[PDB]
Design a protein around this ligand. Structure first.
Ligand SMILES: COc1ncccc1CC(=O)N1CCC[C@H](C(N)=O)C1
Ligand SMILES: [Zn+2]
Length: 139
């Protein structure tokens, strides 16, 4: 699990969104596994506005942060699950590293800020949903 808190916005994995997230829906994209909901309290996470291909992610299944090299956001084929049938997920970045389903929501960060959140895994590859192109999260 895990979310990004910025301004009056909360960003979560779309497959993990709650009834309160859907009741205060701002934007959601199934193709991206992303959902943004509105909040009463103000968030203070910083979003990165860059094209860094290195960073650090939080892995709840090991209680560890890991440095990773990751690909640029792209259309990557994602196997079927209880949440989605087999599809291409857009704005996806892959890295060689450990992940388990419950690690979805863990933040990926560079020197500039929050890059995205864990959203896929398997075969020793972890996939992160990019958020750097969502310029509106800051206004
Ligand atoms: C980080 O997740 C994993 N890591 C290792 C093994 C397995 C996983 C689970 C995983 O990839 N997904 C399940 C939940 C929805 C996902 C999606 N965006 O379509 C796919
Ligand atoms: Zn950066």
């Amino acid at each position: 699990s895990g979310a990004i808190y910025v301004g009056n916005y909360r960003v979560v994995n779309r497959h993990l969104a709650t009834h309160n997230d859907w009741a205060n829906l701002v934007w959601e994209d199934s193709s991206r596994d992303l959902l943004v909901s509105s909040t009463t309290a103000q968030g203070c996470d910083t979003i990165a506005r860059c094209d860094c291909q290195t960073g650090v992610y939080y892995c709840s299944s090991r209680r560890k942060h890991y440095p990773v090299s990751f690909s640029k956001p792209s259309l990557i084929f994602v196997e079927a699950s209880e949440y989605y049938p087999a599809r291409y997920q857009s704005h996806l970045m892959l890295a060689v590293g450990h992940s388990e389903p419950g690690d979805c929501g863990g933040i990926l960060r560079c020197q500039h800020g929050v890059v995205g959140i864990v959203s896929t895994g398997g075969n020793g590859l972890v996939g992160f949903a990019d958020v750097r192109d969502l310029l509106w999260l800051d206004e």
